[PDB]
Amino acid sequence: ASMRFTTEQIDYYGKACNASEDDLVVVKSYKVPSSETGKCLMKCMITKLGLLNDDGSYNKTGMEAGLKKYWSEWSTEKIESINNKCYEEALLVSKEVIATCNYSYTVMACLNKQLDLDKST
Amino acid sequence: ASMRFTTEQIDYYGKACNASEDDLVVVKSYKVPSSETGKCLMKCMITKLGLLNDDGSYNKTGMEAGLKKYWSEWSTEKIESINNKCYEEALLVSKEVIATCNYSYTVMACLNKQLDLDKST
């Protein structure tokens, strides 16, 4: 289990976020694109999904709703537990950090770690 | 379609390649780790899968065999077409480029672009 994005999602939010195809295939290769647009793609995508607020901060209720909508395979129990843990880590971040395009990857790393660790039933 | 790795593959080849969990969750978040070991993880993994030679260069027959093994939902015809194209691109790359850790991501990106252009098979 991981926070996988499908080809369809990548293609849709790639249009929404003005990515090139080269940006998109680099994302799908597990890498952050080097273009100006491509390095902010992830932020743009997960904001449009409601996982982040427009200021870039973790949105607790939006994250839950998005996980339930698109990553329901994780189970509601694990979703609630992981979301509480990652939100709690989010509280400790500065405004400066949240402003960057990289913060999105930080959040996703947290969700992926906690998914690797969570034992909720 | 993309050259997706499963959570189990990432875990296995993470052990094989001496990655830390923080490295692995950054890969699963679609980012290259900045650690010395982590930034080489992809290379190490796809070398162990036989897609690259031990010297880092593209292995035509090993790529075809890995495609057929690990991504067997794709037709032989699609596999051979993406392999031929991305091998042809590989022939133009220097020894200095193949020596890098990042070249692996470039190979993955080429395969991912050719996958996006051959969905009818």
Helices and strands in order:
Two copies of one chain form a homodimer.
Chain A: H1 7-16, H2 21-28, H3 41-48, H4 60-70, H5 76-90, H6 95-98, H7 103-117
Helix pairs in contact in A: 1-2, 1-3, 4-5, 5-7
- How many domains of chain A, as an integer? 1
Question: Given the structure, what is the number of helices of chain A?
Answer: 7
Structural class of chain A: mainly alpha
The most extensive interface between chains reads: A-B, 25 and 25 residues
* Estimated helix fraction of chain A: 55-70%
- Tell me what portion of residues of chain A adopts beta-strand conformation: under 5%
Number of strands of chain A: 0
Query: Biggest sheet of chain A: strands, sense, closure?
Result: none
Distance between the termini of chain A: 15 Å
Quaternary structure type: homodimer
Q: Which value, in Å, is the CA radius of gyration of chain A?
A: 14 Å
Gross morphology of chain A: globular
* SSE string of chain A, helices as H and strands as E: HHHHHHH
Describe this entry's structure for a reader.
The structure is a homodimer of 121-residue chains. By secondary structure, the first copy, chain A, is mainly alpha-helical. The first copy, chain A, has one domain. In chain A, 59% of the residues lie in helices and 0% in strands. Chain A is built from 7 helices and no strands. The first copy, chain A, has helices at 7-16, 21-28, 41-48, 60-70, 76-90, 95-98, 103-117. Chain A is globular.
